[PDB]
Amino acid sequence: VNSFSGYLKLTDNVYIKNADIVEEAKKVKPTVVVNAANVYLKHGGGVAGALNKATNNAMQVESDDYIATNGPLKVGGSCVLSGHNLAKHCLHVVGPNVNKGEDIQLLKSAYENFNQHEVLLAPLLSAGIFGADPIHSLRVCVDTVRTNVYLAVFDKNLYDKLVSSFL
Numbered sequence: 721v722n723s724f725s726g727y728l729k730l731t732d733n734v735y736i737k738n739a740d741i742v743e744e745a746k747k748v749k750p751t752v753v754v755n756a757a758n759v760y761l762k763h764g765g766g767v768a769g770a771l772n773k774a775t776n777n778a779m780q781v782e783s784d785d786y787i788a789t790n791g792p793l794k795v796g797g798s799c800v801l802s803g804h805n806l807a808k809h810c811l812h813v814v815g816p817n818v819n820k821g822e823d824i825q826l827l828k829s830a831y832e833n834f835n836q837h838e839v840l841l842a843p844l845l846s847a848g849i850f851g852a853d854p855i856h857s858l859r860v861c862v863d864t865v866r867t868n869v870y871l872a873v874f875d876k877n878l879y880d881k882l883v884s885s886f887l
């Protein structure tokens with residue numbers, strides 16, 4: 721038993737809700753919140769900009785130190801950093817950005833990072849400003865992640881299309 725509320729159960733291990741991941745993160749304090757990161761951990765917009773703002777820019781400060789030490793992530797890769805006031809940990813995961821021409825097949829590799837964590841609150845990778853089809857992203861998520869994933873979908877209209885079209 722865990723503290724996530726109001727989710728619709730899609731599969732054995734995947735759950736979905738219409739929620740603001742920032743507000744869901746502040747209420748659950750999950751062990752892991754997933755950020756929709758880029759390779760530079762520059763948290764300017766989308767989910768990353770929203771999570772970072774909610775940390776009063778502490779996520780960005782920590783991220784800049786991480787990059788200065790380690791260099792950029794790989795597309796499809798991840799790193800674990802602090803969750804600040806939102807979670808114990810933040811798993812920064814880089815899905816491919818279609819608006820940069822990145823190979824969509826890397827979306828499966830990105831979701832594989834979730835399997836290193838028993839339970840996660842997460843957005844749909846490569847959705848939103850990353851330019852992928854969220855329905856495709858949901859299918860890859862379901863077919864790749866084996867751990868328990870609670871997907872927060874900000875847009876109510878999108879949440880309805882994802883549910884109604886889910887196979």
Ligand SMILES: O=C(NCc1c(C(=O)O)[nH]c2ccccc12)c1ccc2[nH]cnc2c1
Nearest residue numbers: 756766767770843844846847848849873874
């Ligand atoms: O961009 C936001 N959500 C869209 C999105 C999804 C999704 O919802 O499936 N997946 C993504 C992956 C990368 C980038 C963006 C997305 C977002 C979320 C909460 C906010 N709170 C204030 N602004 C906000 C913006």
